[PDB]
Amino acid sequence: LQDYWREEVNEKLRDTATFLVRDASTKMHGDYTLTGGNNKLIKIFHGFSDSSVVELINHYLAQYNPKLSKYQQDQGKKLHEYNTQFQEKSREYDRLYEEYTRTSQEIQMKRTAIEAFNETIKIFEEQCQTQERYSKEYIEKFKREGNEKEIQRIMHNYDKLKSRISEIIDSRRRLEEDLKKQAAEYREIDKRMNSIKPDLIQLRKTRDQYLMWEWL
Amino acid sequence: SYYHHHHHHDYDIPTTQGAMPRSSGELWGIHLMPPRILVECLLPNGMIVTLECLREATLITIKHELFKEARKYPLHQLLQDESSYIFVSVTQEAEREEFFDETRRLCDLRLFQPFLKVIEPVGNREEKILNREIGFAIGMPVCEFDMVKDPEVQDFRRNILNVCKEAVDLRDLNSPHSRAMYVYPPNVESSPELPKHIYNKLDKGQIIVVIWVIVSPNNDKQKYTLKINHDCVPEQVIAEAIRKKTRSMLLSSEQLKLCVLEYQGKYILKVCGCDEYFLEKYPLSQYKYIRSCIMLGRMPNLMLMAKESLYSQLPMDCFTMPSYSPYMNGETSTKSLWVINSALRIKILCATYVNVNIRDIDKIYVRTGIYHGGEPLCDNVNTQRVPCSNPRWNEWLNYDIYIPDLPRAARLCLSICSVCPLAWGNINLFDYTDTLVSGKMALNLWPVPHGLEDLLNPIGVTGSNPNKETPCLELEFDWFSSVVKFPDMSVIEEHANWSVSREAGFSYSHAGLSNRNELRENDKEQLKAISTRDPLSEITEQEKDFLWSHRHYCVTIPEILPKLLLSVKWNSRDEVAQMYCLVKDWPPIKPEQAMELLDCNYPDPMVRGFAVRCLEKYLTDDKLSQYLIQLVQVLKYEQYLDNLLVRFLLKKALTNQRIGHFFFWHLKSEMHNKTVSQRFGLLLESYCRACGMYLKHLNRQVEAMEKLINLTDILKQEKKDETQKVQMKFLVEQMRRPDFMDALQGFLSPLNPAHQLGNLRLEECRIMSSAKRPLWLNWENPDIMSELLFQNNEIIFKNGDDLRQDMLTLQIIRIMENIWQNQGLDLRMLPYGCLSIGDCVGLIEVVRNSHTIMQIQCKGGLLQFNSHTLHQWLKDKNKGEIYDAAIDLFTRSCAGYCVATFILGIGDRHNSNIMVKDDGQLFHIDFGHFLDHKKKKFKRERVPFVLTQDFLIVISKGAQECTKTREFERFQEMCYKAYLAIRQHANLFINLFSMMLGSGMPELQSFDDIAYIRKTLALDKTEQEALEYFMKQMNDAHHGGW
């Protein structure tokens, strides 16, 4: 009834939520095979067809089981122009997936980097305090005992400590706003992939029109 | 005129990297710390003294130099004696790290910011705070687990020590013998008998060995060339060796035998030049080194080592348990699942965000569906709402399955879609404690894979993405005024028997036969027909009902079970309950089938527990280490952390250090991958805590790879766009540094821990020509008898490429080579050693005296390259009686690769893919994409090994019209026998590929990728038709011959 079409029948049934008829794997096994009840295999053997084969297919599925080909003239080189469009569009999809991935690693590198900063910071805050225990236990004297041979230099340590602390919190800050442009850049990369995806699928399908009906 | 004068305005080349991965270095932001560097040092006093010190300086060195310069700064007296102090700083993994092993150098600390801090050893159990060892070996801090909330993790960590403790006791049962079994397990083939073609090399089964010895002055060695039976065990070989030492005119025959007996058991056999050891009752030729020696035309070089001087080496492992150190509640605190009366409903609410254009997409929706791997009801999409801009729902999806039907391994799967999928996640409907999930959940979603166009993705990882900055998806699970539990095994068996007895007395009529002691004899053959079918041969629903009906008969053909289990309806509580009971006392089967039942088609705990029991009885430690890759991948498919298969493997890895080794690397290689990160970390943690001293050997390997990862990174990022010559100056300058000299010398090859890697012969180390700057490394073999095996071990470290496809084809190649060999057919493949140890990072065993066909042709360069150059080049190595062999070898190796590359469908074979050893063996390297990933652009497949003129000559000796020779007819017959041999073991390969769907390889994303291997072996056709398929397809590709 050619006037009706396993691996490639699974492939064409992909992206469908439907039925079609197929030849067997052995001649001696059975005749043909039919493929909404969750897509599964219905052997055409069910001495051939009880209704001459096609009369049973039009007829239909709970009636026996408990758990129950467009020609495409719709709209040579029309492969070459659409397939290079598909591949140059595919090239773009996988262009972004690389950028999508690398950015995601990069981002996660930045937040772990920040956790490092924050802890590093805390060890320097904790330090500037550690002297005020042991330094103003020995600010007891203040003005005498060889004047300020001790007390001038103690300040210099304190002075650097705090200005270093600042440079750390400046570097973290810079990182935090670096992560933001990235987070935004990441969301935007995801965005265009989602706009492409269905167009990329249609080009693969609209290729599949003239795919069956040198260059590539 | 060329381009009809058309300008491309978009186009510009200032920075376009198609012309001419991507683990931070020794400090944050910089790969290689400057040779002098400035380190702020914080003390108990608040002074931050900024020392310069050397990149490579120890913490001791900086300590005693911060001891002296602290005298020059204020407030000295209150700073204690330095011996009462330790360093600590924040690392790049962002953790405060006390630095105990102060032999460690500044570069080797992974320091983030160049600063130290002094404190005292808080927590005087300092021996314990060498978890650092483990966290370094694992590649994440152990304390990162302690802070995990989820009690499944905390339970796993504590519960899995059962297996640790047990395995360590089993090591020390017959010690110190059994500790040397653990450490040096004997390396022996699976079949004790040899194949015929190996036997024939021996004259009625006798090998010439050579035992060696050493005695005072101790720098002298002594050959003792025996001629004993291949099948005599090492004891006897030690005996005959001692007979010759002593045999004398002054010993009688009787005195001799007494002097034998005493001297026998005090010695054991070791392979010269590497740390293999013959430690049990095994026929000499069952050991792999011997059967290897036979084949190559070599004379075994063993050694008589004293058991004293072996048991000298093996250290006391002494495992210690960490800080993580029938109902007494009257029956039914909880409600059994089978009591509940309702359909399943689940509340979708809100997706915190989705990244989509408001223009380009029309509308979006949460799609859902309940699963067992494949689906038990219609997918329940939710209505469209706030499409592409602030999307929340608040609906209750109603799933047509009544709650007591839900199978144990049942899972919600979900995604968000467009008028194509946006982001996905799955959830186990049952928690690890058997408890049916209730309340609200916060399911962060995973980005869709690349090629995956399917909306829902139920083969993806179950659980929420541990990156909180993703599409969150809040949802509620119906609550039945009580905590619900999966029914106890008692309860299920009861209900089985009821449905069994309720079967017996049903109507004369039942929709005909439908899904139900008639022992039909045509039917009794239709089972065996279906039994033997290949796993991927999809079954018809008629055949399911057929199989399902004679289920009780199927137990006599135990091998049918995979086909039976698929046919069972899992959304029928009744059907499943009987199946569970069959499986309870079903009889065990071959590990090659049991493996099938640990793929994604089989999620059920009962089914999978059976499979573990088949393996527990019938899988040998040889066949385990053969299929170790697939078993590690299959851990992913498990629902929960603690389970039968992890316990099995962890035990076997702790039994056997050669398993343990690759089991550690295989987990470690995928440690970067956040979907397995936790599961595998926790497993890696348990292994490191139990494995004993090997942890310290693994740390040397791990610490080595880091240096090499870091070196190549610098080479690939800065020293790119500089001539090889400057890069080679840089390479060697870097390797001579003392931190490298420490780190890259004196450790075990991870390609084979048997081999030791001594000192780095830098004269031979070099950066290869490839763009990815692979390092050719070369080490002295520090073995005492290195002379007899190899003076120099050289292996390739490659930072660019994803090795794990190669890894798998090399695996499959071996398994072909072994199937052939044992079946009689001798086709010598060379499955060189390759090991993925990280995200596109690994090791590759070199093969000395082998060159690409292209290189051969440049040695025979004089306009046009002659096809005879190969044949001439091969004759120039092999002359005389030799020559006929070198052809045989080439012919045998060519046939093997012809069949294997055809079947697997690996990347097209040109001259720089294919290599020839001086001895005449041909082998393929760099396989690329296995199952034809290069048909996503662009029936009847391809022959990827196309036998040029060049090859045909060599097969047929120096010849004209070379397709008509008998040499070529014999070559053809090898290919026919080989192609059929593999086909008769096709299940194994179908399963082995299926088990690897869990690894994120773009070539194995679903069962329809593994389609190819069915078509190429042509299993749907008969064998004679497949023969003629192969001949057809081999004729097509060479334009005649076949």
Ligand SMILES: O=C(NO)c1ccccc1
């Ligand atoms: O689950 C059941 N409960 O009655 C059931 C379903 C179908 C057929 C027989 C029984």
Ligand SMILES: O=C(NO)c1ccccc1
């Ligand atoms: O370099 C080559 N190796 O096969 C080559 C490439 C193209 C054509 C002929 C030879």
